């Protein structure tokens, strides 16, 4: 239905991707003193929006809580130790 | 990033994380940050044995 | 502190404009080349020294 597209790295070059679907859209006619300071959406050229930024992660980081709050080089470590913890690898 | 207007020489584009860890990085900030650390991890995994040669 | 987290925010905003400012003043050729450096390089050299002192 043309509501979503498969963008390879090459085609990517010539598109404009919006992060948050919401915020990066409606006009403007204060803010919370806690959240992270966000820049803007000063543009209307957008061609595509991000399903969700937390999708740029792969299996590893996906289990890491608030990976957006640690020193990146650490996340990279846990990214490895996970493949070394205990649990259940199958039920059979 | 493709999320940016061409020729943006500003800091929010060139990799300046204005946020604090207590607050949390935005995708962009979060990414650059990774690319930065990635360089770090690199030599800690290179200078590790070439340093040992020079030692030897 | 409640207000310190603010006092900082605006030390990045102002620092942001002391950049937007020298970017305007560069996108007009209204700056001279510090001997030995490229007009472009000299642009960075300031942006860098601006954000750093801000962050500091």
């Amino acid at each position: 239905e043309g509501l979503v597209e498969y963008i390879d790295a090459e085609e990517e070059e010539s598109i404009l991707i919006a992060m948050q679907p919401e915020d990066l859209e409606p006009a403007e006619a204060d803010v919370d003193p806690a959240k992270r300071i966000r820049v803007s959406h000063h543009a209307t050229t957008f061609t595509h929006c991000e399903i969700h930024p937390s999708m740029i992660l792969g299996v590893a980081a996906s289990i890491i809580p608030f990976p957006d709050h640690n020193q990146s080089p650490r996340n990279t470590y846990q990214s490895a130790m996970g493949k070394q913890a205990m649990g259940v690898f199958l039920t059979n | 990033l493709p999320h940016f207007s061409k020729d943006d020489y500003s800091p929010e584009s060139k990799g300046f994380v204005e946020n604090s860890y207590l607050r949390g990085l935005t995708p962009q900030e979060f990414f650059f940050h990774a690319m930065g650390g990635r360089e770090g991890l690199i030599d800690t995994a290179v200078k590790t044995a070439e340093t040992g040669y020079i030692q030897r | 502190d409640g207000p310190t987290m603010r006092e900082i925010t605006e030390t990045i905003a102002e620092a942001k404009k002391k950049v937007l400012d020298v970017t305007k003043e560069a996108q007009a050729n209204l700056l001279t080349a510090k001997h030995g450096m490229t007009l472009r390089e000299s642009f960075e050299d300031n942006v860098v020294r601006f954000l750093n002192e801000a962050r500091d």
């Binding site: 990146s72 | 940050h33 650390g37 770090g40 | 750093n52 962050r55």
Partner: peptide, 8 residues
């Protein structure tokens, strides 16, 4: 350093 500044 890398993740703090240039010079750092």
């Amino acid at each position: 350093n890398p993740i703090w500044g240039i010079g750092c």
